[PDB]
Amino acid sequence: SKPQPIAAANWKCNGSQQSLSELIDLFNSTSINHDVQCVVASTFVHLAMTKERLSHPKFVIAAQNAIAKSGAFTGEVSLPILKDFGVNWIVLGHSERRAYYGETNEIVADKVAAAVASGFMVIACIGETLQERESGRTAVVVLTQIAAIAKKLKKADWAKVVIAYEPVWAIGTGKVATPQQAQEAHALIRSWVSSKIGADVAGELRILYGGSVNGKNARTLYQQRDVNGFLVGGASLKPEFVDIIKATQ
Amino acid sequence: SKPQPIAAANWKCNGSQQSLSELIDLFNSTSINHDVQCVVASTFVHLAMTKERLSHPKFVIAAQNAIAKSGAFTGEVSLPILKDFGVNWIVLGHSERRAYYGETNEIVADKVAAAVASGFMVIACIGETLQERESGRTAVVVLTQIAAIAKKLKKADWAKVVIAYEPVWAIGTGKVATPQQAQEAHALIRSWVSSKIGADVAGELRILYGGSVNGKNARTLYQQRDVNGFLVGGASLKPEFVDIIKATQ
Numbered sequence: 001s002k003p004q005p006i007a008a009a010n011w012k013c014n015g016s017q018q019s020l021s022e023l024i025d026l027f028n029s030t031s032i033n034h035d036v037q038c039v040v041a042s043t044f045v046h047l048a049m050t051k052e053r054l055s056h057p058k059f060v061i062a063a064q065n066a067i068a069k070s071g072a073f074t075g076e077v078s079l080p081i082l083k084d085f086g087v088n089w090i091v092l093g094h095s096e097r098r099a100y101y102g103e104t105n106e107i108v109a110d111k112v113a114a115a116v117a118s119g120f121m122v123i124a125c126i127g128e129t130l131q132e133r134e135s136g137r138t139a140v141v142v143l144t145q146i147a148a149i150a151k152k153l154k155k156a157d158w159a160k161v162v163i164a165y166e167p168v169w170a171i172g173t174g175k176v177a178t179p180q181q182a183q184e185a186h187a188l189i190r191s192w193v194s195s196k197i198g199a200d201v202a203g204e205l206r207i208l209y210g211g212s213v214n215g216k217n218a219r220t221l222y223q224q225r226d227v228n229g230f231l232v233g234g235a236s237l238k239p240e241f242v243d244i245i246k247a248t249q
Numbered sequence: 250s251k252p253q254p255i256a257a258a259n260w261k262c263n264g265s266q267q268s269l270s271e272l273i274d275l276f277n278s279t280s281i282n283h284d285v286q287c288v289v290a291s292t293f294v295h296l297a298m299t300k301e302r303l304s305h306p307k308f309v310i311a312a313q314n315a316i317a318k319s320g321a322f323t324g325e326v327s328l329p330i331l332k333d334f335g336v337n338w339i340v341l342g343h344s345e346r347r348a349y350y351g352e353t354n355e356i357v358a359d360k361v362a363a364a365v366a367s368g369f370m371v372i373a374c375i376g377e378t379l380q381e382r383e384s385g386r387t388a389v390v391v392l393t394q395i396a397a398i399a400k401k402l403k404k405a406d407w408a409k410v411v412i413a414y415e416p417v418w419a420i421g422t423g424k425v426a427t428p429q430q431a432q433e434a435h436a437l438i439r440s441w442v443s444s445k446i447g448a449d450v451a452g453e454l455r456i457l458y459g460g461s462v463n464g465k466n467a468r469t470l471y472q473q474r475d476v477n478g479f480l481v482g483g484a485s486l487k488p489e490f491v492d493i494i495k496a497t498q
Contacts, residue, residue, distance in 0.1 A: 013322040016333045043326050044293030045334050065324025072482070073262040074345040075314025077292050084265045085294050096323040102351065233321070 003204050005222070005248040006162065006229035008039035008123060009236035010091065010210075012064065015046055023237065024053045030242050032058045034249050039123070041091055044077055051086065062089030062123070065097060068114040079118050090115055091231075093125045093145075095166050105148035113152040116160055123231065124149055125210065126189075127166030130173050138185065143192055150197065158201045163189060164208040164231040177211045179221050186226030215240035218247035252453050254471070254497040255411065255478035257288035257372060258485035259340065259459075261313065264295055272486065273302045279491050281307045283498050288372070290340055293326055300335065311338030311372070314346060317363040328367050339364055340480075342374045342394075344415050354397035362401040365409055372480065373398055374459065375438075376415030379422050387434065392441055399446065407450045412438060413457040413480040426460045428470050435475030464489035467496035 011020075020042070032038070041062035042050055050061050063082055070078045082090070092115065093108035112124050128141040146163070153161070165185055170177040186207045194202035209221060210231030221227055229248065235241055260269075269291070281287070290311035291299055299310050312331055319327045331339070341364065342357035361373050377390040395412070402410070414434055419426040435456045443451035458470060459480030470476055478497065484490055 010323070013316070013319050013325050013327055013330070015330065043330060044324075045296060045326055045330055047294060048297045063324070067262070070262050072345060073349070074259070074340075074343040075293075075312070076262050077294055078262055081262070081264065081292060081294055091323075094323040096321060100322070 003206055003228055004035050004037055006037045006039060006123075006206055006208055007241070007245045007248055008062070008091070008164075008208065008229070008231050009041065009241055010064065010094075010231055010233055011040070011042045011046075011236055012096075012233065013043065014237055015042060017049070019237075020046060020049065021053070023239075024050065026239055026242065027054060027059060028056045030056065030245075032056070032245065036245060036248050038245060039089060041089070047085065047087065060089050061087060062091060062121075063087055064091050064094070066090055066092075066111070066115070068111055079115055079120070083118055083120075088119065089121045089123070091123045091125065091164075095125060095127060095168050095171065105145050108145075109148040109152045112149055112161070113157075116153065116157050119160075121160050121162070123162045123164050123208070125164050125166055125231070127168045127210070130169040130175065133169040139188055142185070142189060146189060146192060155198060155201060158193075158197065158205065162206045162208065164210045164229075165189065166210040166231070170211060179217070179224055182209050182211060182221055183224035183226055186224070190226055213244055215243035215247075218244045222247050252455055252477055253284050253286055255286045255288060255372075255455055255457055256490070256494045256497055257311070257340070257413075257457065257478070257480050258290065258490055259313065259343075259480055259482055260289070260291045260295075260485055261345075261482065262292065263486055264291060266298070268486075269295060269298065270302070272488075273299065275488055275491065276303060276308060277305045279305065279494075281305070281494065285494060285497050287494060288338060290338070296334065296336065309338050310336060311340060311370075312336055313340050313343070315339055315341075315360070315364070317360055328364055328369070332367055332369075337368065338370045338372070340372045340374065340413075344374060344376060344417050344420065354394050357394075358397040358401045361398055361410070362406075365402065365406050368409075370409050370411070372411045372413050372457070374413050374415055374480070376417045376459070379418040379424065382418040388437055391434070391438060395438060395441060404447060404450060407442075407446065407454065411455045411457065413459045413478075414438065415459040415480070419460060428466070428473055431458050431460060431470055432473035432475055435473070439475055462493055464492035464496075467493045471496050 038059040041064050067076045097103040126145040167177045206228040208229035208231045213230050287308040290313050316325045346352040375394040381390050416426045455477040457478035457480045462479050
């Protein structure tokens with residue numbers, strides 16, 4: 001007995017005027033039969049165009065990142081800026097940031113909260129690496145991350161949260177995650193929330209899988225018991241996204 | 250015998266719809282009597298609005314930052330994206346990035362080049378810190394930075410370059426730079442370019458000062474022999490910017 005699923009497009013560092021024009025036209029002509037929440041998160045440069053073009057009411061826009069405060073922080077963007085722009089969704093702690101940009105469990109927890117404090121909806125990312133997988137550290141690891149976040153939240157805040165789980169271990173390492181594994185992971189986090197925060201809370205919380213999802217392997221993964229959605233990469237620039245959405249019926 | 254000066258507004262991590270609306274209206278009603286190049290660099294979020302609103306023809310827009318390539322680099326922005334958005338000016342290696350964001354002489358040199366390669370106009374930032382000042386290291390330091398850049402350029406590329414000098418040592422340290430000092434610094438770099446690259450090149454190159462400039466201390470600093478402009482912070486959100494511009498007659 002599932003909560004409302006989410007299909008979030010993570011466009012990352014891609015796009016053009018024409019191409020994105022193209023996609024969004026696609027989106028807007030697409031008939032979304034069920035209760036899904038579609039999330040599109042582009043570049044700071046493209047948000048406006050996006051804010052302007054998506055008119056499909058089952059879709060929202062989000063940021064791929066931000067920093068908590070305004071100021072003397074050249075070329076960075078802040079929550080307060082985003083809100084004013086009228087953006088109520090954000091993705092924080094994405095593996096790529098953690099890895100190439102110095103995001104520790106600590107900065108993340110600190111941002112999610114602030115974002116949380118400022119009334120945003122948050123897709124907080126977590127996951128473990130290859131070495132972490134192999135030494136058998138997955139639990140010890142993801143729990144730690146989740147904690148770091150949770151330490152900073154009110155229970156009433158959990159409601160603005162969403163946990164997308166990224167299996168960093170199989171992301172570009174030549175290694176492959178199966179649907180079982182994915183499920184095995186989501187069930188972990190859930191037990192945590194549950195045992196630790198409230199099953200009332202655990203029950204309603206959404207958990208997306210952010211490994212590799214395509215138009216093929218999608219249904220199969222939504223069918224998994226603890227899966228409530230997707231955090232998509234490549235496919236999200238493609239039309240297949242429409243297929244991944246339907247995958248969430 | 251000076252080249253065309255530049256008055257670049259560095260809005261950093263600030264702004265709102267209304268406030269920025271306000272400023273730009275200011276800008277557009279301002280009569281700019283002389284040959285100045287006015288540069289406005291805002292957030293990625295605000296570029297469009299800015300691209301839309303500034304209509305004053307002696308003004309351009311720029312980015313406060315970017316990364317060389319598109320891809321799997323969440324929440325970052327790239328050259329190729331910017332160009333497509335129609336943005337031909339960028340600021341790279343700003344002290345704040347270097348300090349809080351891991352920008353070494355090496356990344357910078359690598360970006361400026363790429364930016365250079367992609368047809369951008371570049372305000373490359375340099376400067377030394379407090380400890381660097383005190384041990385008497387200013388030359389040894391700025392030269393090193395400039396080099397790092399220069400290593401990567403063609404002589405014909407120097408033409409898309411602009412060197413703004415930031416005296417990191419007096420920026421928020423409670424320490425104060427004088428107009429003499431500023432001049433002393435610009436003359437350093439110039440001798441370098443000159444001795445090292447071509448006086449043809451040295452002659453035409455612009456050097457802005459990015460220390461603290463306000464509506465007061467401005468004229469006095471433009472009067473300095475080796476000063477060709479400004480890289481402004483706070484004042485740039487204020488109307489005083491208009492005064493700093495005039496300061497460049």
